[PDB]
Each structure stands twice: as structure tokens, then as C-alpha cells.
Amino acid sequence: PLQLAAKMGKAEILKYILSREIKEKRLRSLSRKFTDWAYGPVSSSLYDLTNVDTTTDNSVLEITVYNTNIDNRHEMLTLEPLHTLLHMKWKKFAKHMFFLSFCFYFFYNITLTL
Amino acid sequence: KESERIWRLQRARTILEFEKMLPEWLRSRFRMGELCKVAEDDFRLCLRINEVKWTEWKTHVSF
Amino acid sequence: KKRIFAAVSEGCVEELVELLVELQELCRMHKLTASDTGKTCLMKALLNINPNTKEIVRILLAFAEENDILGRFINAEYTEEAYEGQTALNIAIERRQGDIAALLIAAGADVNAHAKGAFFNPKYQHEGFYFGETPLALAACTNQPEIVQLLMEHEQTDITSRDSRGNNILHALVTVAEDFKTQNDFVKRMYDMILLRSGNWELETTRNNDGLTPLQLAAKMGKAEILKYILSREIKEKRLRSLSRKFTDWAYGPVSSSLYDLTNVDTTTDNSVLEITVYNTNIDNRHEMLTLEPLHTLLHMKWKKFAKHMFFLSFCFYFFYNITLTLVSYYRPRLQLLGRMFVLIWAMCISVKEGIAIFLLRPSDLQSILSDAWFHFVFFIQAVLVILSVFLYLFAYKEYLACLVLAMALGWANMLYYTRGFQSMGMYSVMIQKVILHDVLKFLFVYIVFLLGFGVALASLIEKCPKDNKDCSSYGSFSDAVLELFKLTIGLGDLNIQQNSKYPILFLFLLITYVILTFVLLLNMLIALMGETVENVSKESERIWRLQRARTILEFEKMLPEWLRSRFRMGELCKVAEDDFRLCLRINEVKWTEWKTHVSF
Amino acid sequence: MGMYSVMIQKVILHDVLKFLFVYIVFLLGFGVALASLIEKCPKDNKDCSSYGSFSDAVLELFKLTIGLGDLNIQQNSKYPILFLFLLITYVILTFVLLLNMLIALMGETVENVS
Ligand SMILES: C=C[C@](C)(O)CCC=C(C)C
Known about the structure:
This is part of a larger assembly, with four copies of chain A.
Chain A: H1 2-8, H2 11-18, E1 33-39, E2 42-48, H3 60-65, H4 80-92, H5 96-113
Antiparallel strand pairs in A: 1-2
PDB class: membrane protein
Keywords: membrane protein
Entry title: Cryo-EM structure of human TRPV3 in complex with linalool determined in MSP2N2 nanodisc
């Protein structure tokens, strides 16, 4: 149902499931977000990436990034567990490699011109 | 006001494409380790997030 | 040890009443804390306020006072590299719990406990939470009126206490405000309540470690509503009349005579509020803050008394210098040496005047090269061009003509800086400086990419002419092809066919593709970009022009010498009745709309 | 047609005049620079230079402002690179900046005027 809500385009259901916090001890296992500590305006949320990170098959991030044809894939991509995942993925890698690809293509194009 | 969505989605698709380009041995850049809070085999693989909401806190504390 | 922690984590009262019966029997110093970060069970009970919170902390403090340790570890220290300064009272006040905080205060806690830490003193706003690092300022920051009344109505509450940053309570209240009013602001009313309840003037005279009062701090940080409240703070009570800045001398229907205070507002002291609010454009909120009455009338009357005749004098001097620079080159031999020396004297004067300015500026104002920093560069370049061209003129060189021609071509285009006097042309000039750096640069980069890509393709498509006279090909090099493509980009011609190219169809196809990409795509979407930009700019450029004129007024004020700065404001009040140290300003302002609305109901 | 006529009388006095003043400033500044850049012709027949006076340079700059021509190079100028650079700068400032923001100004004016 998580991947189905991401693929079909239901933004509010995906937002609710990805940030589902239950404070009851009996139903704590049915949760994905845990607040480690809260201090005024700051908060330490422990989000769950069981099927969200693109390490499994047909992950939620890959599903929500490769289905542009429904057009609702930015208000859905701006959700916290996806937005911070893409941002930190872009910080750790996929940015030095993007500049490396640009440098290789620039050298190839200038040596094709010369 | 709409092209910002398309540029952000294009950059996200570029990030995912570069992620898929990496080999299996180089994909050791995974997320935070186990919770240990599940207390049943600790099969979870979570992510630490320290997010700030100054506007939401100001509105909540105002009332 | 962990049993008590598990008891306080989820509020297991029965577990703790069993533990306080079992533990002390084995006891007959007690390391009840976590022994690694200093987190005692008091905090661990108080981060998560479970429904059973009163009795558990009550019996815990009863066990503490039974062992004669209640007065020892009540001010427990969260000794960790991030916090390093937390106590039980701080967490109790934060968690919106006043009863427990009242019980802790009655039992005896550290009222003035500095919570000095790296997380508590963030480098930026988003890095952490800053609340003044004191329980009193924390109670005032997190909208807790009952708790801050309890904290202030105490004996050893150090109200005039400054934390590691040197911030007072009012500095902390300023730093936690908002640039725009949310219509439900509590920091302003808590500032008001704290000011009236305690402190006369030393509470607001205390300076930050940066050297700022709460007034200057509110002006620098960008808090417009707090600055508006302080600059127009009127108290009608005789006991608290001294804590006021605006006094209404007389009111007559819609007109009013407000006696505003300029103790630290006029730019006669060091780091004044007017200079602070006019030299910090990078926060962008410096026109709705500059439009406040004690600043707006100050800038207007400063512009009336001076800084307007001097602006016209500067324009006249630059106009005469530019016209006598033009007439020297145009009337040059292929009697009038006074002009030929006036250019040298004025170029040297403006060169050193721009050199000291180029050395005294900060790198912060160079962002987006909009905050009156580009014009200094162009003025300095023109000045150095004139003197260097004169230097090569005296040395009997040859390159003096090129430098002097560029100098006078730059000088006539530099007269657009002096158009700030008029509002209608000021809008046009600020639009010039905005669109050249926002939309024209991107189009220029894209078109340059499309130029040097098609330029080398057409240049490499055609070989040399059979006669080798370089006339039958019209594209014999890269520079020639670049110029010939740009000429047809303008629309002048030279797009005909049969240019000795071995592939006339491909050459024609590339020319048509370049024509489409430039004339139909880039030259048209440039229209799109500014067209969308101006609809947002036409109501925003007024702020930039007014701020530029205000910065010009302040710069001309700083230019005046000490003896000529006798144009100060109105004299002493004599109403303070204590040494009459005030230096106020008479203001007769009219509010017909406000009076009509007030009298209508 | 009354709407068209009142729009004529409004925009000529509101937007066209400011653009005309700015462009005239940019014309007589570049006009004397290019006129002073080139000396007299060696044959002294006033045909190899094409910029022999201020009025000639003003007319020849305005002609290429319209888009008629006469922007070619090697006009007997002692500094052909500087002359070309000044011509390109004038072309940018007129065709790309002033002629385009004039479009911006009436474009914003008419939405309030109509
Ligand atoms: C307004 C400042 C400008 C646009 O850089 C003028 C440039 C003119 C030259 C270099 C001759």
C-alpha cells in the first residue's frame, strides 16, 4: 500500500504513512516516525526507511521519481523522508560525479572541436 | 512558478540515475544503522533526522 | 540503577515507591544520575510529561531531602558537549509545566542558571534553539506569562544578567521575533510587560558583546515590529513616563505633536540606529523598517537641510568634468590648458576618494553587486583610466588614445548614478541595474554558447579560396565567422549562399538552425523573462530607490566635517527633570484617515 | 479608437520620453568616442573612415540601432579591436537592454491602463 500510494499519486496518504507516529506502547510497532527528543522548535525525528531507500526492488523513492506522467510528483517529492533522502544523496555523491561528467563531456567536446 | 517543480524533479531523476550507475561494491553509502528499539530482531534500518520548525513552534506556543 | 530510569521514563509510580523502599536499605554520595552525560532522573521524568508527573517528582524530592541531598543535586548539570548547562528547572519551564516549576522554585533551585552550550548557542538560526540561556529568558521566550511572573517576583532573580553572548532578556526577546508581523505577536507584548514590571533604563542600556543595545539589535537583525514599538513607545503613567520615547505635546483632532526621542537614533553617536537600518540591505527588510516615522522624517529633513544641494553640486562637478574630458579629446591637435589640468586634478581626487571607499567596504555588500558597490568599481575604473592615459600621454606613448577613449565612453555612461534625485528616473535606473544582472547575463551566456558552437562549424565547413585571396569564402577563420553570424543576428545581412562551401545545403541548414535558435527562441524568451520580472519588480523597485537615496543621504552626512556638523536636531526636553540629558525631535504629524476611523465609531 | 488615441498620448509622455533620454545619453557618449577613435583618412577624401565627425558617427550609430547596417570593421581606425568592442557594447546596451526594458515598461503600464 505504501508503494501503491506513491505510484498512483495519492500525496496525502503517502505523507501520512511516511510520517505515521504512534505514542502508544501497544501500537508503537505500527509506526515509521519516532521523535527521539523534542526541544522547543527543534526535533529529532527517527524516520523509517524500510522500503523508502532505493536499496530494495521497486522502492518508494524510485517509484515517486520515475512516474512524472501523473504530474503530482513534486508536492509528493517534497515530503520530508524523500526530500532529505535526495538532498543527502546529492551531498554524499551524485554531485562530484555530475561535475565529473560535465568535465569529461567538456574535454571531449573541446577536443572534438580542435 | 511551475518550472521549479520540473527542475527539482529533473535533478532528483539525475540523482537516482547516478545512484543506479554505481556498482555493488561502491554502494556502501547506506543510511543509519539499526534501531534496537523494535526489540524483535531489530530488523529496521532507519534514518536520523534533526528538523527545525520555527514557524510551527511559534504558532503552537502562541496559543 | 536502570530500574529507576525505567520507572521515570514511563511514569511507573509503583516501581519507584518500591525502589525508594529497597534502595536506601542497601545504602545504610548517591550516583543516581546517568554518570556519563549528567542526565539525572528529574530531567528524564520531565522531558516526557506523563499523566502521573506530580507524585513521582514529589516522592523523589522527598527521598532527596531525607538523605540531605535535596540542596545538593537539585541544580544538576547536563554535562555534555552540546548542552553543558541544563538544569531541572530549565526543562520544567520549557515543557509548559508551571506547577512543577513552582514546586522546584519553592524547594530551592538555581534561579539564574546559565545554560552555556554549543547547541544552545547556534551559529545560525536553523542550527539550534537560542532562548537567552537563562530560565527567565526561556520563560519569556516560550510565551509563558504565569511562569515569567513567578520568576520575576523573586529575590535572587538576576534580571540584569547577560549570558555568554552578552545578551540580556530583551536581546533574547528580539532574537526570537519575526521579520513580518503574524498579527498574534507575543514577543512584543512580553517585551512591554518585562520593561514596565522591572528595570528603568540600565536594563535596556546593557550592550551585547557585539556592542549593541536591544534597540540597535532589533534594527540590525531585521525585527520591524519591535523596532516600531520601541521607537514609538508612549507611556502615559507618571511613574513610568521615563521609560518612553514618544510624547504627545498636544492633540487636536487629526493633527498631533509627537515628541520623538533621538537618543540613539540620530547618526551623531557611534553605530546609530539610522546608520544600522540603512547599511544592512542584505536582510531585504530595510524599507518597511525604514518607513517608520522617527527614521522617515529624519531622512526627509536631512535631505531638505543638506545632502540635496550637495548632490546637485556633485552632479554639476561631474558633468563639467565629463564635458571637459570630452572636449579635450574631440578638440585635439591631430591656451585651454585649464581644462587639461582640471581633468587631471578631478581624476586624481575621485581616484583616491574611490580608493579609500574600495578599501573600507565589507565583502557582504558585494553580494549580487547591487548594494551600491558596482558604481564604485566603474567610477574607480574611469578615474584610473584617465590618469593612466595622461601618464602615457606624458611618456610620448601610443596607447593613450585607446585608454582615454574608453575613459570618456565610460564617463558619459556613468552619469546614470546621479539620477537618484528624481523618483521617475530612479525607477528606470534601478530597473537597468537589476535586469542587466538578472536576465541579460543568462541570455548572453546561452547565446555565446550558441555562437561559438555554430561559429567553428561554419568556419570549418569552408576551405580556403582557390585564388587564396580570402574573398570568395567570407568565412576564413573563427573570428570572421563569429562576426558574420553576429551581424545577421542583429539583422544586417550577409546570409546569402554559395560562399565557396563544399556543402551548401548543410551550410544553409546550419544557418537556418542558428537563426531559429537565436531570433525565434533566445531573443523571444528574453522578452519572456523580463516580462515576468517587471510585474514583480514595478512595486518593489520603489523600496530599492528609497533605500539608495537614504544611503546617499547617510554617505553625504558622513562626508561633512566635524565643524560643519552643526545641523543637529531639536534641543533638550527639560521634561525628564533629571539632568535633562535627552535630545528629542519635534514632529507635527497628521493622520486624517486614522482620525476619521476613530471618530466614526 | 478613442482608447488607442489616449494610449498614444499616455505612453509617449510616460515611457517613450524616459527611454529616449537614456538612449540619447548612450548615443552622444559612444558617438564622440568612436568619432575621436579614428583620425582623418590618408587620402583626405573622407571616404575610408566613415566616422569623420560627431554628427556622422551619431547618424551611423543610429542606423545600426534601427538595424540597417554599416557595422563592418576596418574603418581606418587605429584600434580596430577597441572600436569593435565599443560597437558591440553599444549594440548590447541599446538592442538588448533599452529596447527591451521599454517593452517591459509599457507592458506593465497597459495592464493598469486598459
Ligand atoms: C554603465 C556601465 C557600462 C554599461 O558598463 C558602460 C560600459 C561602456 C564601456 C565599457 C565603453
